[PDB]
């Protein structure tokens, strides 16, 4: 909306005022990143939120500078579900994620970059139909995102296999109250999956 | 619309239920104006924690005190009411509900220092959140009563409003906002400057 536009500039202007240091562990993405208290979840003061609700691949791309100038230890990226909601193809989304990977590697070569599987979605709550109705695209993106990681020599994290239900290909509803965002237990699963990579 | 705000509240609330609160913790508690900051970064203080929920109202804050107060935090910083203003709620009923937050906090964690922060001015200039912005006058009505309440209950009143407002208009200085309601980074630096002395008492 005009709200997501305005919220973007609020969060982006704030991040411009906060220093990133070489010890930092950045979580970078859309609402699913924005929704967490990352330092609390890992109990690690070097872990920082660079999530913006409604963010898309090129929104993340356009605000790398206040993050990369700090040369953080780690970036955990989760992006693309909002690009799905706009009818963008997995291939187009992969090309944009490529720009982010290559920009990070060039501006901050020492940063460990971890590409996180797009999370599954679920239309069972009848919300975010632009997202939940393109549930098949989640798999499409990750089947390309993993080889993108191998080619660019960066880690791929499979969150998807944990959050997904075997026989639907949709978000386990115990992780979500809308089919898109995580409840507490959703972030506790994330924590258990990614924790070993926060402590590499 | 209100469904996304309702589900977002349960999302933030259930996460806070999994996040332990301790005797050293400094809590920023309130609505999207609290939610929007990275508090521990703003104050370079690992003890400072975000319990902001976009869209929250006084009774939404009241109903979620348990997982904050049971850890007996060092400080709570409260900023709440503008979403109640947006529902046509009177400054009197708002104060009434803020008074129940204050007594629950004292009762459950009496060593917790509580700080009551002036409700921030709004500005209809951007034509956004017209529920909030048309009612810019109700801001100062709440604050006229909020300072005497603090004094009554023996808790701090922090005046943010006098720094954010344009005295000529009675509205949010557009330099701190792109929508009439929420803060730009600059907005949060002005907030830090005002509150850091209370954060470090
Ligand atoms: Mg559920
Ligand atoms: Mg402005």
Author numbering:
A (entry chain BBB): 22 to 221
B (entry chain AAA): 21 to 221
Paper text:
Here, the crystal structure of a 9-O-SAE from Phocaeicola vulgatus (PvSAE) is reported. Structural characterization revealed PvSAE to be a dimer with an SGNH fold, named after the conserved sequence motif of this family, and a Ser–His–Asp catalytic triad. Biochemical assays also show that PvSAE deacetylates both mucin and the acetylated chromophore para-nitrophenyl acetate. Therefore, bacteria employ esterases to make acetylated sialic acid more accessible for cleavage by sialidases.
A crystal from the Apo I condition diffracted to a resolution of 1.44 Å and had P1211 symmetry, while a crystal from the Apo II condition diffracted to 2.06 Å resolution and had P61 symmetry. The unit cells of these crystals contained four and eight protomers for the Apo I and Apo II forms, respectively. These protomers were arranged as dimers in both crystal forms, recapitulating the dimeric form observed in solution. The PvSAE Apo I and Apo II structures displayed a near-complete overlap when aligned [root-mean-square deviation (r.m.s.d.) of 0.18 Å], with the secondary structures in the same conformation. The only major difference between these structures was a small region of the most N-terminal α-helix, which is discussed below. Mg2+ interacts with the carbonyl groups of Pro194 and Thr197, the side-chain hydroxyl group of Tyr146 and three waters. Docking into the ‘blocked’ site of the Apo I structure resulted in a ligand conformation with the 2-position projecting towards the N-terminal α-helix, suggesting that this active site could only accommodate monomeric substrates. A similar conformation to the blocked active site was observed in the Apo II structure.
